[PDB]
Amino acid sequence: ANPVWTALFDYEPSGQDELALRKGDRVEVLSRDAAISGDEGWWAGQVGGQVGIFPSNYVSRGGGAIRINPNGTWSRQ
Amino acid sequence: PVWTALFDYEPSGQDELALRKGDRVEVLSRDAAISGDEGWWAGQVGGQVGIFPSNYVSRGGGAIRINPNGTWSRQ
């Protein structure tokens, strides 16, 4: 498998290659690295049988109970 | 205005800023003048000005965060 991230917010595609997200969706992340530099920040993922690109700032790892701090420690929320 | 880096990012181009998760980023422009550069923002990290992907930051460095769907949260 690939890592599974969770959508934080709804996202509505603006084009046909973009993946629609709704809050709480589990997204399998297939690539975090755009081939074209102008697309950096968009990740490829799969949800619901569909594969497309989505903005990385709409997803998180898990549900929020554990936080990774800037200094690399973990905390409970 | 202060933003926070969401992810580590290692740059691979000229003028691009290194990000580490949790960095404070001061955003200078949210709008590339050229169409090829749309999606990249200009800002300053650690005293250095350069560009970075917009989607690798979130707004706010204190108790209130602004999400990209236009909502606000307590951090």
Curated annotation (Swiss-Prot), chain A:
Tissue specificity: Expressed in a wide variety of normal and neoplastic tissues including fetal lung, liver, heart and kidney, and adult lung, liver, heart, kidney, placenta, skeletal muscle, pancreas and brain.
PTM note: Autophosphorylation on serine and threonine residues within the activation loop plays a role in enzyme activation.
Subcellular location: Cytoplasm, Cytoskeleton, Microtubule organizing center, Centrosome
Domain of life: Eukaryota
Signal peptide start and end residues: none
Protein family per UniProt: Belongs to the protein kinase superfamily. STE Ser/Thr protein kinase family. MAP kinase kinase kinase subfamily.
UniProt function note: Activates the JUN N-terminal pathway. Required for serum-stimulated cell proliferation and for mitogen and cytokine activation of MAPK14 (p38), MAPK3 (ERK) and MAPK8 (JNK1) through phosphorylation and activation of MAP2K4/MKK4 and MAP2K7/MKK7. Plays a role in mitogen-stimulated phosphorylation and activation of BRAF, but does not phosphorylate BRAF directly. Influences microtubule organization during the cell cycle.
Name the UniProt record assigns to this protein: Mitogen-activated protein kinase kinase kinase 11
Organism whose genome encodes this protein: Homo sapiens (Human)
Classification of source organism: Eukaryota, Metazoa, Chordata, Craniata, Vertebrata
Residues of the full protein shown: 42 to 105 of 847
